[PDB]
Design a protein around this nucleic acid. Structure first.
Length: 79
DNA sequence: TCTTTCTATTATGGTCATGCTATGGTACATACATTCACAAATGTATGTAAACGTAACCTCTGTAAAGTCATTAACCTATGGCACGAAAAACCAA
C-alpha cells in the first residue's frame, strides 16, 4: 500500500534527474529501489513527513546509479 | 455463407573514393583493507687459479723391394774353302 501510493513521488523526483547520463527507465527502477530502502528504515516518533527523509535516500540511489557505470569503462565514485 | 477498404514489414548496386572529431552537468563524512614501492638477507652463481694424461711428434736405426751393372756365352757379321747351276763353246743328226 505504501509503494502503490508513492510510485508517483518517485517519478516526480526522477523526471528532474534525467540529464542524459543513461536511459531513464533504469533511473525509475533505481528510484523504486531507493523508495523501498527508505520505507524499510522509516521512523514514526520524529513527527516529520516521509518525503523529506526519502529524498536523501532516493538521491543517493540515483547518484550511485549514475556513478555506477556512466561510460563503457569503470570509473570509481570518488573520481 | 463470401470479395473489397483499411493496419504494418520487406525492397535497389557498388564499384573509383573524399576530410576534421565532440555534444550542457548533477554531495559530502567515517571506514578498513588490498596493492605498489622500497629496506635487507639467502642462495646458488659466475669467473680466477692448479694438477694429470694423452690429443701426440720429430728423431734415428733396421728390414725390405726396386732401379742398375759385374760375369759368360749365344748368335752373328765377318773370313776361307768347296759344290752348283747358269752361260757359252763344241759337235752330231737330218
Amino acid at each position: 500500500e505504501m509503494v502503490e501510493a508513492n510510485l508517483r513521488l518517485v517519478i516526480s523526483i526522477a523526471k528532474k534527474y534525467t540529464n542524459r547520463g543513461l536511459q531513464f527507465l533504469d533511473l525509475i527502477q533505481e528510484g523504486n529501489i531507493g523508495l523501498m530502502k527508505a520505507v524499510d528504515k522509516f521512523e514514526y516518533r520524529r513527527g516529520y513527513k516521509f518525503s523529506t527523509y526519502a529524498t536523501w535516500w532516493i538521491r543517493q540511489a540515483i547518484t550511485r546509479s549514475i556513478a555506477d557505470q556512466a561510460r563503457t569503462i569503470r570509473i570509481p565514485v570518488h573520481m
